Amino acid sequence: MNIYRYEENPLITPLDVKPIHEGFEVIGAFNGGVAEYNGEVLLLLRVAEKPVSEDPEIVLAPVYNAKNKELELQSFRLDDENYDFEDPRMIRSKAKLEGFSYLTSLSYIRIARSKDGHHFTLDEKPFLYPFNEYQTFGIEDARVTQIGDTYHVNFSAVSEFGVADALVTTKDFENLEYQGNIFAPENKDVLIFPEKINGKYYALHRPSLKSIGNLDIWIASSPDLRSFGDHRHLLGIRPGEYDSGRVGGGCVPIKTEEGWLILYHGATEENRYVMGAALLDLNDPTIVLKRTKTPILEPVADYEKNGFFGDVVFACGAIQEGDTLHMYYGVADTSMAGCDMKISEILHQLEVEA
């Protein structure tokens, strides 16, 4: 397909960002939400900070304590026979390898801005930093849906209570209004549709299920983008294919003449993440018209294959300029990259492959 990976990729790396917690290192600046505001591209960067131990036998988990409003650190020995450290993102109980006890880093959101879409400058301070008991392990993966003058900023809120999805609204990225957890745990990859559709708002979501059910995309409707209901299954995993392990929403749904174009991430059970596409009915987006059989973006550049958690491209938003999509994506849970694609070429791939 025409994939124009920007010459400047990776656009923003951990080298570009100073840690805000003393004696932490920045291990990632990634999975950035995408907005246009006041003539600039805003990336709402996920910045992950890991606390450094000088003893290599020990690792630390950073926990934001909501009751005293400070960082506490939990220590573990790597030889602790009750825990598994083989996944660099998490500290897991050997008896519960399907989950985690702690993360290895703590994330917050920080805005970078660009005039040209290629060269970015960080805002001075964080944008959103854990501020309640649903956020003690961090705030991650902010998505931005702009409806009129209102930006809907929604993000994973991770804590000992579960992984929930929460919403902040703003008109200027300065005065923020907190709207609570719009999806109960366990959920993430929530993408609000950019219009009211035959009298209702909609959002993509992604329940994670303990007992039965795969890691599949769902959809829900809403009268007001505060409360959500009429939950339906939308897109399921496909055994043996690029999305055999999980699927989740990526970019905000894109209105086309052919339907709502859904650029979603898929991963195998080995955790190689790629982007795919789906097409939903314009008037009832609970109906799937088409889906790709092969990816539209794979981790093939070196910054995509190698880093903190290699073989990942993870797109959390894009700017439409006519037929061109300026798509920004996390690479290897480490950095941010940019590429241009064409909506017509993705719609073409959908037609051919379905």
Ligand X SMILES: OC[C@H]1O[C@@H](O[C@@H]2[C@H](O[C@H]3[C@@H](O)[C@H](O)[C@@H](CO)O[C@@H]3O)O[C@H](CO)[C@@H](O)[C@@H]2O)[C@@H](O)[C@@H](O)[C@@H]1O
Decide whether 222 or 334 has the Cβ nearer to ligand X. 334
What gap in Å lies between CA 310 and CA 247, rounded to an integer? 18
Give the one residue of 314, 319, 327, 334 binding ligand X; rule: CB under 6 A.
Answer: 314
Residue type for position 293: K
| Partner from a copy of itself, ligand X, none binding residue 344, C-beta < 5-8 Å depending on class | none
| Site for a copy of itself contains 196 (CB under 8 A) | no
| Site for ligand X contains 251 (CB under 6 A) | no
- 291 has binding-site annotation: no
Is the dihedral angle over the CA atoms 248, 4, 9, 269 positive or is it negative? positive
Contact letters (x/-) for a copy of itself, 219-258, by CB under 8 A? -xxxxx-xxxxxxxx-------------------------
Q: Are strands 121-122 and 138-147 parallel, antiparallel or unpaired?
A: unpaired
Residue 97: strand, helix, or coil: coil
Decide whether 119 or 233 has the Cβ nearer to a copy of itself. 233
- 195 has binding-site annotation: no
Considering the complex, what minimum distance in angstroms separates the CB of residue 229 from a copy of itself?
A: 3
Contact letters (x/-) for ligand X, 203-242, by CB under 6 A? --------x---x---------------------------
Please give the residues from 94 up to 133 whose contact with ligand X meets the rule CB under 6 A.
103
Q: Are strands 58-65 and 24-37 parallel, antiparallel or unpaired?
A: unpaired
Give the one residue of 213, 269, 351, 354 binding a copy of itself; rule: CB under 8 A.
Answer: 213
Distances in Å between the Cα of 276 and the Cα atoms of 5, 81, 241, 297 are 17, 39, 11, 7
Decide whether 113 or 188 has the Cβ nearer to a copy of itself. 188
- 140 has binding-site annotation: yes
Please give the residues from 27 up to 86 whose contact with a copy of itself meets the rule CB under 8 A.
none
| Site for a copy of itself contains 205 (CB under 8 A) | yes
Give the one residue of 203, 333, 341, 347 binding ligand X; rule: CB under 6 A.
Answer: 333
For residue 139, give every residue at least 6 positions away whose Cβ sits within 8 Å of its Cβ, in sequence order, or none.
107, 108, 109, 128, 129, 130, 155, 156, 157, 158, 166
Distances in Å between the Cα of 314 and the Cα atoms of 33, 51, 88, 89, 299 are 11, 24, 17, 16, 9
- 273 has binding-site annotation: yes
What gap in Å lies between CA 229 and CA 227, rounded to an integer? 7
Contact yes or no for 245/225 (Cβ under 8 A): no
Residues forming a β-bridge with 107: 48, 138
- Count of residues near a copy of itself by CB under 8 A: 47
| Site for ligand X contains 49 (CB under 6 A) | no
| Site for a copy of itself contains 209 (CB under 8 A) | yes
Greatest alpha-carbon pair distance for the chain in Å reads 59
Binding site for a copy of itself (CB under 8 A): 96, 98-101, 133-134, 137, 158-164, 179-187, 205, 207-213, 216, 218, 220-224, 226-233
- Binding site: which residues? 31, 46, 89, 140-141, 188, 273, 333
